[PDB]
RNA sequence: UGUACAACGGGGUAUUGUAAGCAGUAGAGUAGCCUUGUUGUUACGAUCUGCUGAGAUUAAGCCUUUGUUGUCUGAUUUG
RNA sequence: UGAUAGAAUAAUCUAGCGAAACCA
C-alpha cells in the first residue's frame, strides 16, 4: 500500500458488524481516548497448553471511557448508486464542545451554529416528526450521531468529537424512536460492551512514516471499569482499595476518573488519541475468543521512573515517617 | 506473592526486579537495577544509607513490634475457612494502622531531646561572657 | 543466551569439565544471525577438557543453566550463576546419574529423564 | 535595618529611571508634533516632488531634536 | 539587530540558578532578539553557535563560571568579528525572589508587552577628560556605542512613541567602579508628565574585567585589573 | 470576561544518594601537659556518627491546582 | 586609480549583465 498520511485523526469505520434484528436496539462501536499501558497478572485457563492453570503476566492497553451522548441520527436509503443519507436529524440543545466542532474561530464567532434549528422544537415538531416518520418509512439503515464528554477528560482540546454509529438492533422505527428517547441523554459502554468481548480497534497510528489509519482486530476486553468504583485497580485477589490510575498517573495523559476499558495486547496510535472501539465483524469462536479470563493483580506503579509501590499508603507504610 | 527486595527490603512484584540464583540455589530478588548493580559490585546495604539494612540497623525507625507477630510465612497450610478471611482483612488494616502510629510516635521521641540539648548548648553561649 | 561457539559447564558426573557448543539443534535460518542456545535446549557440544574419551567427540547436551535474564511466564526476570549443560543421548536419557547445581524448571519440565536425574531444581 | 537603607538607593535610581524617561517622552512628543505642523504648513505644499521634501523633513527633525537636547 | 544569550561551560549549564537568569534575560529583550524556544541547550555544542548564528543574528551573550574560583562572568560579543567584553557579576538576584520581597502586579506574562525596550544611560560615560587616563574614556565611549548599537537604532522623530512598555537603565558611578542594570515596567499617569515604574525581572551589578576579540579568547585587546 | 488562558506558587509521582553547617571521644597515631594513668586528658587527626531516604532535579513532551498575579486583539475574504 | 555588486563572518540567494550550438 502507498503510505500516504491519514485524512482525519479520527479514523473512519469503513465496515460495521452484521445486523441482527432479533437483538434489542444497541450500539456497535464507541469512541474513547487511550491513556496508556500497564501489566496484568491473571491465570490462564487453556487446556492443551502447558500454561494451563498458571499465572500469566500480560500487557494491556487502557482507553479512557467518558460516557457518550447521542445528539442526532442519520438514515441512509439504498440507491442503485450506493448509500445516501436522505436527511440527518439533530436534537435541540447541543454543547459548546459540539458547536465548537463546527467552528474554526469559536473564540470570536457569534456562536450562531444551530439557532434556527432550535426554532424547530419551538413548534410542535411537525417538520421534525415528519422527518422521523420519513426515516421510519424510508432509510433502511440507521446511523446515530454521538459525541463524547471531553470536558470530563484530561484532554486540552475542549472540542469534542462527533461520529456516526450504525445501529444493528431491530426495527428501524424502534431504532429511530430509541434514538429519539436517547437524544441528549447518555450511553455508557456497560450497556454496549462487556467483559471478555473480542473487539477491533480503529485508530490513526503514531506519526514521527506514521499517521496512518489502522484497524487491529481480535482484542479481548479485560475490564469494563466503572468511574464510581474506587476499587478499579482491585481484584478478588488484590483487595487493595485503589483505582486504575497509575502511581503519579498515566504518563503524558492525566488520569481516569471516568469509566475505562482495559483491553488485551497493544493498539495502533499513541496516548491522547481518539480511538474507535468496534465490536467484532463476526462471532469469533477460536477459544482465544471464548475465554472467560479472571484477573489477579493490577500494576498501578509509576512509569515516570522505576516504580516500587502500588498505593502511596503502601509507600508510607514501608518508608515510615520522614523528616518532612 | 509478594517478596522483599534483597537490597531494598522493598516489596517485589511480578514484572518488577531481577532475580539472581547462585549455585547453592538461593534466589535473590531486586526491585530495580540499582539494587541489582549494587549487588553486582559486592556492596553492603549497611554502607548505603537509604536502604533498610542501614535504617533498621541504625535506629531511625523501630524494628521490632508486637504487631509484627502476625506477618510470617507458614509452611504448613491451613484448610479454607471463609469466616477467618474477613477477620484477617480487618487484622491487616488495623495492624498496619497501629504500626504507622507506633512508628510516628517512636519518631516523636526523637525531636524532644534536641530542645533539651539546644537549651544546654545555648547556656554555653551565654554563661561564658 | 549461548550462541554457536560457547563454553558451558558440565553438571553431570560423567567426567567432562566443559562443553563447547558447535551446533544448535532446532534453530531458525536467518542470514547473519547466530543459532542461540538457552535453557531447555539440546545442542551439539564438544568436550574441551576432562577425560580424553569424552574429548574429540561431539555429544548432544541439554542446557540447565543460562546466566542470561529471561522472562518466565509468571512475572520474574531471573538467571543462573553460570552457563551449564549436561551431555546425554539424542533420546534425552541422561548419561550422568546425579546432576549437580540448580536445574531450570522449564528444562526439567521439558525432559522427564533430566528431572529424574535432577537433584536441584532452580 | 541596612536593607532599607539599600532600598533608599534603589528607589533613588528608580526615580532616576523615571526622570529621563519622562524627558525623552515629552521630547519625542514635542519634536514629532512641531515637525508635523511645520511640514503641514508650508514645506509639503510648494514643490511636492518628494525628492526635496524628505530632506527638509529630516533637517527639521534633526534641528528640533538638537534644540530639545541641547 | 538581533541578539543571543548562552551560558558557556559545564559549570554554567550545570547550574539550575543560571537557567533562571537565562529565562529572565530572554523575557527582558525585544521581540527581534527574542531567542525563545532556545531553552534546551545541548551538551555537545560548544562555541558552535558561531557557524550557524551569523546567518541571522548579532551580539551574542555568554555566561561562564571559573572552575577554580566561585565567580560567574558575563561576556558581550558580536557575531561578525569585533570585540568581546568580560564582566564579573555582583549580587545575582532571582526575579522570583523580587516577587516575594515585594509583590507587584507584573505584565511579564501577557503578550501586550511584546515590545522593544529602551535606552537609559545613567552617566555611564563622560565626554570630558576628568582624569589622567583617556583610555578609560575610550572604554566608556566604545561601550556606549555597544549599548546603543545592540538595541535597534532610534532616530527618535521617526520612532512611534506608542510602545514604551519596557525601559532599561545602566547605573555607573565612577567611584564605585560598578555598573548595575535594573529595568522597570512603565505605567502612565494621564496628566496633560507623570510616569510610574514597577520592577519586572532580574536586578544585577557588574564589574569591568577585560576586552577581547569578538571571537572569544581570540585577541586580548585591553586588560583592566 | 471564563470550571477562560498564562507566569508563579503548592501538592502528587519519580531520579540521585545523606547537602551546607553544628556537635563528638569515634578515630589508626604524633607531639603537649601534669594529677605517670588501672580508658588521666589537652592540641593535629584522611575518616566516622547524630542532626539527615537528608540535600539536589522533576518537564522542558509527567499529573493536579477553591493560593497569588496579569491578560483578552488586530489584517484579509464571501452572498 | 581599478574592479559584477549585495547578503550569507572575509566559507547559498537576490540583484545586475547576459550568450552560443541547434532549429522541413
Ligand atoms: Zn531494591
DSSP per residue over C49-88, as a string?
SB-TTTBTSEEEEEEEE--S-EE-SSS-EEE-SS-EEEEB
The answer to whether B31 and B10 have CB atoms below 8 angstroms apart is yes
CA dist list (Å): E124 to A100, B39, E119: 57, 64, 12
Q: Resolution limit in angstroms?
A: 3.7
Residue C79 touches chain B, beta carbons under 8 Å: yes
Instruction: With beta carbons under 8 A apart, name residues in chain A contacting C73.
Output: 51, 54-57
With b for 16 or more beta-carbon neighbours within 10 A and e for fewer, the E186-212 pattern comes to beeeeeeeebebebbbbbbbbbbbbbb
Domain segments of chain B as ranges: 1-64, 65-129
Burial (Cβ within 10 Å: 0-12, 13-18, ≥19) of residue A15: exposed
Instruction: With beta carbons under 8 A apart, name residues in chain A contacting C75.
Output: 39, 41, 55, 57
* Size of chain C in residues: 122
Q: Does residue A228 share a domain with residue A146?
A: no
Burial (Cβ within 10 Å: 0-12, 13-18, ≥19) of residue E89: middle
CB contact under 8 A, A41 and C75: yes
Beta bridge partners of C18: C9
Q: Which residues contact A46 (CB under 8 A, 6 or more apart)?
A: A52, A287, A291
- Helix D53-69 vs helix D2-38: angle between axes, to the nearest 10 degrees? 150
| Cα(A187)–Cα(D57) distance, integer angstroms | 74
Inter-residue long-range contacts of A17-24, CB under 8 Å, 24+ positions, other chains counted: A17/A168, A17/A278, A17/A279, A17/A280, A17/A281, A17/A282, A18/A168, A18/A281, A18/A282, A19/A141, A19/A166, A19/A168, A20/A168, A20/A170, A21/A169, A21/A170, A21/A171, A22/A170, A23/A168, A23/A169, A23/A170, A24/A169, A24/A170
| Cα(A196)–Cα(D62) distance, integer angstroms | 85
- Which residues span the domain enclosing E96? 1-225
Distance from CA of A42 to the nearest CA of C (A): 9
- The CB density around residue E55, as the number of other CB atoms within 10 Å, is 7
| Cα(A96)–Cα(A116) distance, integer angstroms | 16
The answer to whether A308 and B35 have CB atoms below 8 angstroms apart is no
CA dist list (Å): E80 to B7, E76, E146: 58, 13, 14
Q: In this complex, which of C74, C75, C80 lies closest to B21 when CB atoms are compared?
A: C80
- The alpha helices in D1-70, defined as continuous H runs, are 2-38, 53-69
Helix (H, G, I), strand (E, B) or coil at E201: coil
Measured CA angle at C50 (ends C45, C51), to 5 deg? 100
| Cα(D18)–Cα(E81) distance, integer angstroms | 36
* Size of chain D in residues: 70
CA dist list (Å): E49 to A231, E41, E55, E146: 55, 11, 10, 21
Residue A41 touches chain C, beta carbons under 8 Å: yes
The answer to whether C67 and C45 have CB atoms below 8 angstroms apart is no
Q: In this complex, which of A39, A50, A55 lies closest to C74 when CB atoms are compared?
A: A55
* C-alpha torsion sign, points A48, A54, A60, A65: positive
Fold held by C1-122? Ribosomal Protein L14 (2.40.150)
The answer to whether A200 and A281 have CB atoms below 8 angstroms apart is yes
Among A191, A265, A262, which Cα is nearest to A222's? Answer: A262
Residue B60 CB closer than 7 angstroms to strand F? yes
Residues 122-151 of chain A whose Cβ lies under 8 A from any Cβ of chain C? none
Helix, strand, coil shares of chain E, percent, nearest 5, are 25, 25, 50
The C-alpha cell at C103 is: 536445574
Ligand 1 centroid to residue C104 C-alpha, Å: 24
The answer to whether C63 and C85 have CB atoms below 8 angstroms apart is yes
Q: In this complex, which of B19, B22, B25 lies closest to C76 when CB atoms are compared?
A: B19
Q: In this complex, which of A50, A51, A57 lies closest to C75 when CB atoms are compared?
A: A57
| Cα(C56)–Cα(D57) distance, integer angstroms | 106
| Cα(E96)–Cα(E94) distance, integer angstroms | 5
Q: Does residue A227 share a domain with residue A91?
A: no
| Cα(D59)–Cα(D67) distance, integer angstroms | 12
Report CA(B124)–C1'(F37) in Å, whole number.
30
Q: How was this structure determined?
A: cryo-EM
Q: Does residue A196 share a domain with residue A95?
A: no
Beta bridge partners of C65: C84
Q: Does residue A316 share a domain with residue A201?
A: yes
Beta bridge partners of C59: C45
Sequential DSSP letters for A24-73: PS--SEEEEEEEEEEEEEEEE--TTSTTTTEEEEEEEEEEEEPPEEEEEE
The residue whose grid cell reads 410542535 is: A124
| Cα(E159)–Cα(E174) distance, integer angstroms | 32
Name the DSSP letter for residue D41.
I
CA dist list (Å): A318 to A14, A204, A308: 52, 43, 10
Report CA(A198)–C1'(F79) in Å, whole number.
52
What distance lies between CA A107 and its chain's CA centroid? 28
CA within 13 Å, CB half, E220: 6
**Strand G within 7 Å of which CB atoms in E 183-222?**
215
Nucleotide nearest to A318 (CA to C1'): F53
Q: Does residue A194 share a domain with residue A59?
A: yes
The answer to whether E88 and E207 have CB atoms below 8 angstroms apart is yes
The answer to whether A166 and A141 have CB atoms below 8 angstroms apart is yes
Kind and range of the H or E run holding A279: strand A274-279
**Strand F within 7 Å of which CB atoms in E 63-102?**
96, 99
| Cα(E135)–Cα(E141) distance, integer angstroms | 10
With b for 16 or more beta-carbon neighbours within 10 A and e for fewer, the B72-105 pattern comes to eeeeeeeeeeeeeeeeeeeeeeebbeebbeebee
| Cα(C102)–Cα(B22) distance, integer angstroms | 8
The answer to whether E120 and D21 have CB atoms below 8 angstroms apart is yes
Burial (Cβ within 10 Å: 0-12, 13-18, ≥19) of residue A104: exposed
CB contact under 8 A, D28 and E194: no
Q: Which residues contact A138 (CB under 8 A, 6 or more apart)?
A: A75, A77, A86
- Which residues span the domain enclosing A323? 1-66+188-205+210-324
Backbone φ/ψ region at E139: left (φ over 0), alpha (ψ -120 to 50), beta: alpha
| D31 backbone dihedrals φ, ψ, rounded to 5° | -65, -45
Q: Please, what's the largest Cα pairwise distance for chain A?
A: 78
Nucleotide nearest to E55 (CA to C1'): G8
Q: Which nucleotides in chain G lie closer than 7 A to a protein CB?
A: 8-11
CB contact under 8 A, B103 and A321: yes
CB contact under 8 A, C73 and A56: yes
Residue E79 CB closer than 7 angstroms to strand G? yes
Residue E105 CB closer than 7 angstroms to strand F? yes
Number of domains in chain E: 1
Residue A277 CB closer than 7 angstroms to strand F? no
CA within 13 Å, CB half, E163: 15
Backbone φ/ψ region at C64: left (φ over 0), alpha (ψ -120 to 50), beta: alpha
Measured CA angle at A170 (ends A168, A175), to 5 deg? 80
Ligand 1 centroid to residue A306 C-alpha, Å: 10
| Cα(A315)–Cα(D6) distance, integer angstroms | 49
| A295 backbone dihedrals φ, ψ, rounded to 5° | -75, 165
Report, in angstroms and rounded to the nearest whole number, the Rg of chain E calculated over CA atoms. 18
Q: Does residue A159 share a domain with residue A76?
A: yes
Among A186, A266, A203, A194, which Cα is nearest to A225's? Answer: A194
The C-alpha cell at A78 is: 439504498
Instruction: With beta carbons under 8 A apart, name residues in chain B contacting A305.
Output: none
Domain segments of chain C as ranges: 1-122
The C-alpha cell at B31 is: 526491585
Nucleotide nearest to E82 (CA to C1'): G9
| Cα(A103)–Cα(A88) distance, integer angstroms | 19
The residue whose grid cell reads 523615571 is: D18
Residue A57 touches chain C, beta carbons under 8 Å: yes
- The alpha helices in chain E, defined as continuous H runs, are 10-14, 16-28, 49-52, 95-101, 135-150
Beta bridge partners of A294: A43
* C-alpha torsion sign, points A47, A50, A51, A54: positive
Distance from CA of A55 to the nearest CA of C (A): 5
Instruction: With beta carbons under 8 A apart, name residues in chain B contacting C75.
Output: 13-16
Torsion of CA E12, E14, E18, E19, to 10 degrees: 120
The answer to whether B74 and B88 have CB atoms below 8 angstroms apart is no
Helix (H, G, I), strand (E, B) or coil at E197: strand
Q: Which residues contact A107 (CB under 8 A, 6 or more apart)?
A: none
The answer to whether C78 and C65 have CB atoms below 8 angstroms apart is no
Query: Mutate which of E157, E167, E195, E202 to disrupt the D interface (most D C-beta within 10 Å)?
Result: E157
Distance from CA of A249 to the nearest CA of B (A): 18
| Cα(E166)–Cα(B93) distance, integer angstroms | 61
The answer to whether A149 and A70 have CB atoms below 8 angstroms apart is no
Ligand 1 centroid to residue B20 C-alpha, Å: 13
| Cα(D36)–Cα(D28) distance, integer angstroms | 12
| Cα(A307)–Cα(A299) distance, integer angstroms | 10
The answer to whether B33 and A76 have CB atoms below 8 angstroms apart is no
Amino acid at each position: 500500500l502507498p503510505r500516504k498520511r491519514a485524512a482525519s485523526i479520527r479514523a473512519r469505520v469503513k465496515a460495521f458488524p452484521k445486523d441482527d434484528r432479533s437483538k434489542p436496539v444497541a450500539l456497535t462501536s464507541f469512541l474513547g481516548y487511550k491513556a496508556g499501558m500497564t501489566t496484568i497478572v491473571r491465570d490462564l485457563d487453556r487446556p492443551g497448553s502447558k500454561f494451563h492453570k498458571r499465572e500469566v503476566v500480560e500487557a494491556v492497553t487502557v482507553v479512557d471511557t467518558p460516557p457518550v451522548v447521542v445528539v442526532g441520527v442519520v438514515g441512509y436509503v439504498e440507491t442503485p448508486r450506493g448509500l445516501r443519507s436522505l436527511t440527518t436529524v439533530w436534537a435541540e440543545h447541543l454543547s459548546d464542545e459540539v458547536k465548537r466542532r463546527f467552528y474554526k474561530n469559536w473564540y470570536k464567532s457569534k456562536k450562531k451554529a444551530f439557532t434556527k434549528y432550535s426554532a424547530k422544537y419551538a413548534q410542535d415538531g411537525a417538520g421534525i416528526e415528519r422527518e422521523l416518520a420519513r426515516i421510519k418509512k424510508y432509510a433502511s439503515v440507521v446511523r446515530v450521531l454521538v459525541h463524547t464528554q471531553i470536558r470530563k477528560t484530561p484532554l486540552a482540546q475542549k472540542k469534542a468529537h462527533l461520529a456516526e454509529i450504525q445501529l444493528n438492533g431491530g426495527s428501524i422505527s424502534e431504532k429511530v424512536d430509541w434514538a429519539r428517547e436517547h437524544f441528549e441523554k447518555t450511553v455508557a459502554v456497560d450497556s454496549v460492551f462487556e467483559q471478555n468481548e473480542m473487539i477491533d480497534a480503529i485508530a490513526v497510528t503514531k506519526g514521527h512514516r506514521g499517521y496512518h489509519s489502522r484497524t487491529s482486530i481480535n482484542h479481548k476486553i479485560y475490564r469494563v471499569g466503572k468511574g464510581d468504583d474506587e476499587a478499579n485497580g482491585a481484584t478478588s485477589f488484590d483487595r487493595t482499595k485503589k483505582t486504575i490510575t497509575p502511581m503519579g498517573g498515566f504518563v503524558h495523559y492525566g488520569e481516569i476518573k471516568n469509566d475505562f476499558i482495559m483491553v488485551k495486547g497493544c493498539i495502533p496510535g499513541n496516548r491522547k488519541r481518539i480511538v474507535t472501539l468496534r465490536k467484532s465483524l463476526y462471532t469469533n469462536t477460536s477459544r482465544k475468543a471464548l475465554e472467560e479470563v479472571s484477573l489477579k493483580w493490577i500494576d498501578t506503579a509509576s512509569k515516570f521512573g522505576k516504580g516500587r509501590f502500588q498505593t502511596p499508603a503502601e509507600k508510607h507504610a514501608f518508608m515510615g515517617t520522614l523528616k518532612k | 506473592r509478594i517478596y522483599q527486595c534483597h537490597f531494598c527490603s522493598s516489596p517485589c512484584y511480578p514484572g518488577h526486579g531481577i532475580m539472581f540464583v547462585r549455585n547453592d540455589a538461593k534466589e535473590f530478588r531486586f526491585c530495580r537495577s540499582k539494587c541489582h548493580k549494587a549487588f553486582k559490585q559486592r556492596r553492603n546495604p549497611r554502607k548505603l544509607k537509604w536502604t533498610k539494612a542501614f535504617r533498621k540497623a541504625a535506629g531511625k525507625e523501630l524494628a521490632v513490634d508486637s504487631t509484627l507477630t502476625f506477618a510470617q510465612r507458614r509452611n504448613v497450610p491451613v484448610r479454607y475457612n471463609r469466616e477467618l478471611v474477613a477477620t484477617t482483612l480487618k487484622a491487616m488494616a488495623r495492624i498496619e494502622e497501629i504500626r504507622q502510629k507506633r512508628e510516628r510516635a517512636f519518631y516523636k521521641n526523637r525531636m524532644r531531646g534536641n530542645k533539651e540539648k539546644d537549651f544546654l548548648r545555648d547556656k554555653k553561649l551565654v554563661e561564658s561572657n | 543466551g549461548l550462541p554457536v561457539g560457547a563454553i558451558m559447564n558440565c553438571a553431570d558426573n560423567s567426567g567432562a569439565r566443559n562443553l563447547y557448543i558447535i551446533a544448535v539443534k532446532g534453530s531458525g535460518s536467518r542470514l547473519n544471525r547466530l543459532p542461540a542456545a538457552s535453557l531447555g535446549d539440546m545442542v551439539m557440544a564438544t568436550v574441551k577438557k576432562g577425560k580424553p574419551e569424552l574429548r574429540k567427540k561431539v555429544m548432544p547436551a541439554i542446557v540447565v543453566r543460562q546466566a542470561k535474564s529471561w522472562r518466565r511466564r509468571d512475572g520474574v526476570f531471573l538467571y543462573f550463576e553460570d552457563n551449564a549443560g549436561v551431555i546425554a543421548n539424542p533420546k534425552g536419557e541422561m548419561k550422568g546419574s546425579a546432576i549437580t547445581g540448580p536445574v531450570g524448571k522449564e528444562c526439567a519440565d521439558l525432559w522427564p529423564r533430566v528431572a529424574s536425574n535432577s537433584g536441584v531444581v532452580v | 535595618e541596612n536593607i532599607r537603607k539599600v532600598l533608599e538607593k534603589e528607589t533613588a535610581l528608580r526615580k532616576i529611571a523615571q526622570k529621563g524617561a519622562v524627558k525623552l517622552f515629552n521630547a519625542i512628543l514635542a519634536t514629532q508634533v512641531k515637525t508635523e505642523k511645520e511640514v503641514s504648513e508650508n514645506l509639503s505644499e510648494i514643490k511636492n516632488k518628494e525628492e526635496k521634501k524628505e530632506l527638509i523633513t529630516e533637517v527639521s527633525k534633526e534641528k528640533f531634536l538638537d534644540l530639545v537636547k541641547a | 539587530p538581533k541578539s543571543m544569550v548562552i551560558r558557556v561551560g559545564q559549570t554554567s549549564l550545570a547550574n539550575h540558578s543560571l537557567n533562571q537568569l537565562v529565562k529572565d534575560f530572554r523575557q527582558i529583550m525585544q521581540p527581534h532578539t527574542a531567542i525563545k524556544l532556545k531553552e534546551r541547550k545541548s551538551n555537545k555544542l560548544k562555541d558552535f553557535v558561531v557557524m550557524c548564528g551569523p546567518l541571522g543574528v548579532t551580539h551574542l551573550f555568554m555566561f561562564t563560571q571559573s572552575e577554580k574560583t566561585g565567580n560567574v562572568s558575563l561576556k558581550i560579543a558580536r557575531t561578525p568579528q569585533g570585540p568581546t567584553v568580560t564582566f564579573q557579576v555582583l549580587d545575582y538576584s532571582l526575579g522570583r525572589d523580587i516577587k516575594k520581597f515585594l509583590k507587584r502586579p507584573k505584565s511579564l506574562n501577557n503578550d501586550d508587552v511584546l515590545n522593544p525596550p529602551l535606552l537609559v544611560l545613567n552617566g555611564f560615560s563622560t565626554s570630558k577628560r576628568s582624569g589622567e587616563d583617556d583610555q578609560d574614556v575610550n572604554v566608556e565611549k566604545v561601550i556606549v556605542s555597544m549599548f546603543q548599537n545592540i538595541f535597534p537604532p532610534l532616530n527618535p522623530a521617526r520612532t512611534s512613541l506608542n510602545s514604551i512598555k519596557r525601559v532599561f537603565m545602566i547605573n555607573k558611578d565612577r567611584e564605585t567602579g560598578e555598573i548595575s542594570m535594573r529595568h522597570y515596567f512603565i505605567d502612565i499617569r494621564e496628566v496633560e508628565k507623570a510616569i510610574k515604574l514597577t520592577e519586572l525581572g532580574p536586578r544585577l551589578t557588574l564589574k569591568l574585567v577585560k576586552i577581547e576579540e569578538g571571537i572569544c579568547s581570540g585577541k586580548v585587546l585591553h586588560h583592566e585589573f
